Amino acid sequence: QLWKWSGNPTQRRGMKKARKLFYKAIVRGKETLRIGDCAVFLSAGRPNLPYIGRIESLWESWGSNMVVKVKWFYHPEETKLGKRQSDGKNALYQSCHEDENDVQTISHKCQVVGREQYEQMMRGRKYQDQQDLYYLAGTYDPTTGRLVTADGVPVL
Template sequence: MAKTKPGKKDLDSYTIKGRNKVVRPGDCVLLRPSDSDKPPYVARVEKLEADHRNNVKVRVRWYYRPEESLGGRRQFHGVKELFLSDHYDMQSAHTIEGKCIVHSFKNYTKLDNVGTEDYFSRFEYKAATGAFTPDRVTVYYKCEMPYNPDDLMVQCEGC
């Protein structure tokens, strides 16, 4: 965990204004974009801190949507798919719109109902280089495509 600067204090939690939802380090949040036509940004809270005026800042680790990555969105990317990046930032806590849940791919595919706050991540993304970890995933026999949880896959005889 990063050291807190003089004049700042670490916080255990932050309550989202008007939402009465409590955010803690480790939670995933939706952050308001500057362009209201865009969907909210998604990030994982790493740290909360307040200055001497009680202005709360949040250190976040960003999730990228496929279209925000170097390779762009591909056919096998799910609608709710995100990539956990190595991109960290400090943001005003006032930009937090709400909480969300970023599931592992395996847990996401087991959900009975996918809510608006549910996302999944199966890759980590290096923002500077565009590299992914893992750099390959299981593909299917005939189509040679990774599984997209939004598409019903009917097993062929070869798969």
């Protein structure tokens, strides 16, 4: 019931300069999590719906501190605009705003696919409101507040 490293690491420096050992993947029993896969985390603050992010760099510092750098997704409720009318279920807005967190705060691996792929996948199972599959709806920048659709269309 914990996340452990998987595979040989590589030593490097910098990245807020000090020394660390960067790994490529973590494992929790049956579950695997490689760099590039999307993961739902364990959130507790004021953000509305669960934080979901893409892993960019896993490392361990001196003292066995497991740190994961995450590029954040954004639910429609977390933007400066509310859930757009007819936005869709399980919509995620891509962002290029990243930060570091603890590796053990990862709830479970998830998938982020296109809208048509999302609707083709979620066609049968009656238990639809899950937390394992989401669809990309566009790009959101928290610094500017601007957000565009999955086709490059800014909104108001």
